[PDB]
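Q: For a teaching session next week I want to show students how multiple molecules come together into a single three-dimensional assembly. I've collected the sequence lines for a complex. Could you give me the predicted structure tokens for the whole thing so I can convert them for display?
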Amino acid sequence: LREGEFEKAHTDFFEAFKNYDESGSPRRTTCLKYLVLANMLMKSGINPFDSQEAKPYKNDPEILAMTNLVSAYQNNDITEFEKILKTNHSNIMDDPFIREHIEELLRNIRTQVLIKLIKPYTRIHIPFISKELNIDVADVESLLVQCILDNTIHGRIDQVNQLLELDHQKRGGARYTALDKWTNQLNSLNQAVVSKLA
Amino acid sequence: SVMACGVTGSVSVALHPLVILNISDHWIRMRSQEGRPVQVIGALIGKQEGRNIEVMNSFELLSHTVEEKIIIDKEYYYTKEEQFKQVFKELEFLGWYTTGGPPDPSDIHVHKQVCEIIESPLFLKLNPMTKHTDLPVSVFESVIDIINGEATMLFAELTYTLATEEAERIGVDHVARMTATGSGENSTVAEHLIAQHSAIKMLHSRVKLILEYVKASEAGEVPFNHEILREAYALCHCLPVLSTDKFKTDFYDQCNDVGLMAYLGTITKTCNTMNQFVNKFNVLYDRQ
Amino acid sequence: TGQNQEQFLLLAKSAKGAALATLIHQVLEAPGVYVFGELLDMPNVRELAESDFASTFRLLTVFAYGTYADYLAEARNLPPLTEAQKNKLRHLSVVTLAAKVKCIPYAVLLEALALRNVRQLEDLVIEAVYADVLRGSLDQRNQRLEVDYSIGRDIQRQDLSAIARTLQEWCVGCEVVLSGIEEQVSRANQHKEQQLGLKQQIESEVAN
Amino acid sequence: RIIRGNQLQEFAAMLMPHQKATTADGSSILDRAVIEHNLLSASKLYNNITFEELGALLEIPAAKAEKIASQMITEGRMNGFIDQIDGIVHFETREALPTWDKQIQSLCFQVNNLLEKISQTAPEWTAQAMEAQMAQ
Amino acid sequence: KFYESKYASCLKMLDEMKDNLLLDMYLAPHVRTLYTQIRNRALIQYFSPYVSADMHRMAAAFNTTVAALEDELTQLILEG
Amino acid sequence: SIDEIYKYDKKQQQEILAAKPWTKDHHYFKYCKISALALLKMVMHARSGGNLEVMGLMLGKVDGETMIIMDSFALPVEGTETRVNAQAAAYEYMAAYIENAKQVGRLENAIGWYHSHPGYGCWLSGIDVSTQMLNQQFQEPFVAVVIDPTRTISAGKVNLGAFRTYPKGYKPPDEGPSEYQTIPLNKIEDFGVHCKQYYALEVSYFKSSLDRKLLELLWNKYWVNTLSSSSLLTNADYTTGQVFDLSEKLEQSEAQLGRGSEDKLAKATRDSCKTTIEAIHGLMSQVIKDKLFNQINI
Ligand SMILES: [Zn+2]
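A: Of course. Below is the structure for the complete assembly, covering every listed component.
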């Protein structure tokens, strides 16, 4: 988890949870917190309590703070997610292994939400996206770039106008690019016929 | 009379000529089998979106006769419903067809048996040995009103626009206009513009014969009619078919594209004709 | 229209002068009846013309020939109209502009219909197409009203030659192309028989 | 076809008390499922419109129109897109040269419609103008 | 800070390291082609995402002036 | 009477089946009469799938040297051209269709199989030859038909072919011109190998009395579709593609002149005309329309 490769932590916390399942369970109540935290931050899992040994202990009123978050993460509900952090503050925000990865987890959703919001739009205000995700403009503007840098959000920013024009303008780019090649081959071809004769 | 005649509307219908030919093959083949005319019956299928309905393809159905009542053997329909859902998985069940006169009691009894299957069954009827100079293929639907204290079924007639598919249109243009030893020297522009030539002949035939009525109506003696001449006033001013600043730009946009393709294509032919000349010069004249 | 010029034409023969002074306000203010070929051209109504019932006669000519600008010019010489009749004229006053000019700018329709804003205009145009008068669409940013199809209100035996001439130019056009094809078709075969003949002369050179 | 908010009242008066059932925000199926139909009807009739002037037609504050219109695209019931800076939505256009082919047919079928009605109503002049093709 | 795209600091750091890295034996003879090629890389990466970018913001972000940035980019437009 | 052919003599079929003039002469069947319905449905089946090849089954009969095709339909199979005999997936829907069809009218027997070739001529590939050889091996009188839907459009006329394969042992006679069609280089190899192993059939098209009379009555309102045709955005992805093919064919013959299958500029010249000839013919029907409908004045 510390190293980043959550695929090698995820499976580690399933086997350790099973050893506390057989014998003593001082860590079993907090070991499932790292099995679920993996599956969310694994950015794919989103299926913890449907496994095997987590079925009868999903009810457990200690880890039920994390049961509200996995579906909130899965459904991409932020106002719900952040409400669970405020109320269940002692459960989640006191643990230093959940306090570290809290924001990286919040992003993974934030972006997810934004993708759906922008999809229908072509051009959109930053001030509106600010209010929508509920966040400072600068921080939004920043986050937008990153998605574009890694190339998930197809879009570009007009910094002066505080907006986001979105990639979409699609037309017959094939005809022109294909003909471009034919134009080039003829260029090199006719000179090869001239260099034959003298 | 057992048809509707009222202020209709409802759905808007299209019609593929493949459907006409699949019925035509089905009539001629079943006619030929028994040495007499036959009332063949079959099923209709195609695309259905919102109100509008297109009929794409058509096939046959099994039928029997309890007394004088035509019984659609439904056990056959459900069997063919399997096989047509396989090949055309997109297509839906729409209606049915038959041959003979106009709508009548013997088809209303059959329309009830199709009404058990679906909630909006269309109905085509074709007259094989027709007296009409027009087409004898009319489309209908089920409508029900109070016939003096009696709720009962009727047929509201509807019109049909023809199908457009470019691949199909050629099929029509090939069998209805056959090259039976009618092209020797390739020509290419002869084998292409033959389509437009006699197609526009139809356009000119129609447009002129309307104008013959227009001149004679005002001239007099030829019956003056308000409700026909009215549509002509629209027809002729409703022309200038797109002189919008945007449209023509787009038209010229296309032309230039095609032009580019000709410029490159001509350079290619020149380039070959050049190299045809080059090699013949660079061997006979030149010493390699 | 079709039903309400059989229900209201059966009652256009069997009706005196004051019976038609009422009936003229009935047929006009009744949606569906946008055509006025028959009702104006009837012996019964022609006696009303320039008589004691002359106000109701002039009104039937406006809906069967003129426009809304003509109504507002003749606001006193005609009887006072309600909004539902003003709308039916505001429909037909566009249909005329539509037959001539197929791409209509918005501002145009504020002038010929004396309207106050787009919101209304649009609404009125909605009803136009809704009553199966016109076909088309709008272009908000560009301020346009494209008209895919419009019905023809008038018959015009006055200008039946204005209908005939436009038809002749298309009949001419039909010939323009028809003969234009047959020339180019006969030439594309001639240029093929030009080359086929000229390529037989190239091959026969080799026999020497 | 589009349904106004004055026929919403007309039809609301005809309804029975229990039929106006509300969930979550206190709005009816009527007052939301109605105005959403208005958009879809307006969509293909128009090709584009502002939210101010759109909301004015559908009887709501523009903000609402803008937002719910987005849903109907997002959920996938009416193609189109939004330009928030301008305040315009773009609808089912399908314009340009494809339109040309339909506008040919739109008039070409009127030639056949006006043909049929002369061949029908005037079978004498049909027989007269018949040989205007033959003698020519 | 390059990947996080906080360039104001990224170069601030690197500039003050240049003093020590030059005195190094094997890292002296590549102190331009590296340092400049990174600046270039970042200058591309900052802009590409934007369709329209304010130069004044980009100026202090790349530890320089507006006028300087103007010419800086100019070359890179032609070549890069 | 034109309806001499829509008749079906069943006892005459089983006398020819027993007699067999196909086991005596290897290239007996040379002609192929395609009906009205057969043509339309085959063309419709090819284009309906479109970019992807899909095969169906044909029904018909024999007469002289002519293998007549009466009626056709589809086989809901996949992997045409990529599998040798792709009809094996739906062995059910061959016999089950003809068993249903014979109850309603279609008495005609299995006569062949047809497939679509979108944007690359009409011919039998190496996969197609292996299918047809073994089809003729057991299920005799079987003819392999091909249609090119994308070019049928752009060329502006029925692009179609009907072929029969030869034995593996006996090899064909000399008389063979065989007309040239643009073969994309990606496929030219596959064709080139197995192209000489088979022989084509002389295609002819017929129609009934009713069909003929219906199509004439049909044409009253079908002239409208001819002058709103527009073969441009319809088959846009054949012409735009043929460029990619054309570019490669030149690329070869350019270097062929240099250092280093006989003059591949003569082919490419014919391809550049072929593809552009279409593109021009397209703009003929466009200007024809601009002349007609736009230029009337008000
Ligand atoms: Zn093949």
